[PDB]
């Protein structure tokens, strides 16, 4: 599944459900900038988590930094690379359901998505 906003496409947003005992999750997606002007993923809003921290600099995965989206390029958020940390889960996440999230882009603005929840 995929979502479009402006000239951006967010393809198969997904995450691995927290392991039993853990309250944190890692959010992943394949983001395309199909436009001629740059953009940035600057925030993520999720009701089921206390906060969301964008780790968009693949060279330094401990830094809180937006995901830069240069024109005409595909940026992948994936395990072992850039990702969004979802911190302080409020209820248990059901594998097979979606996690409803709002992505906030600097120029293209907000888009409401459903992330596919995988087993731990
Ligand atoms: Cu999908």
CA–CA dist 83, 27 (Å, integer): 6
Taking the centre of ligand 1 as the mean of its atom positions, its distance from the CA of residue 118, in whole angstroms, is 12
CA–CA dist 18, 12 (Å, integer): 19
Q: How was this structure determined?
A: X-ray
| Number of separate domains in the chain | 1
Phi, then psi, of 32 in degrees rounded to 5: -110, 130
As to burial, measured by CB atoms within 10 angstroms (0-12 exposed, 13-18 middle, 19+ buried), residue 41 is buried
Taking the centre of ligand 1 as the mean of its atom positions, its distance from the CA of residue 108, in whole angstroms, is 21
Give me the domain span that covers residue 76.
Answer: 1-120
As to burial, measured by CB atoms within 10 angstroms (0-12 exposed, 13-18 middle, 19+ buried), residue 6 is middle
Taking the centre of ligand 1 as the mean of its atom positions, its distance from the CA of residue 35, in whole angstroms, is 22
């Amino acid at each position: 599944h995929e979502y479009d906003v402006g000239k951006l496409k967010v393809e198969h947003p997904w995450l691995r459900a927290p392991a039993d005992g853990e309250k944190n999750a890692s959010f992943y997606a394949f983001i395309h900038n199909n436009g001629d002007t740059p953009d940035k993923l600057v925030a993520v809003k999720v009701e089921k988590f206390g906060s969301a921290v964008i780790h968009g600099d693949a060279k330094n995965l401990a830094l809180e930094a937006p995901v830069l989206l240069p024109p005409k390029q595909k940026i992948t958020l994936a395990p072992g690379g850039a990702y969004v940390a979802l911190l302080d889960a409020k209820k248990h996440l059901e594998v097979g359901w979606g996690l409803e999230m709002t992505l906030v882009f600097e120029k293209a603005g907000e888009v409401v998505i459903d992330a596919a929840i995988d087993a731990p």
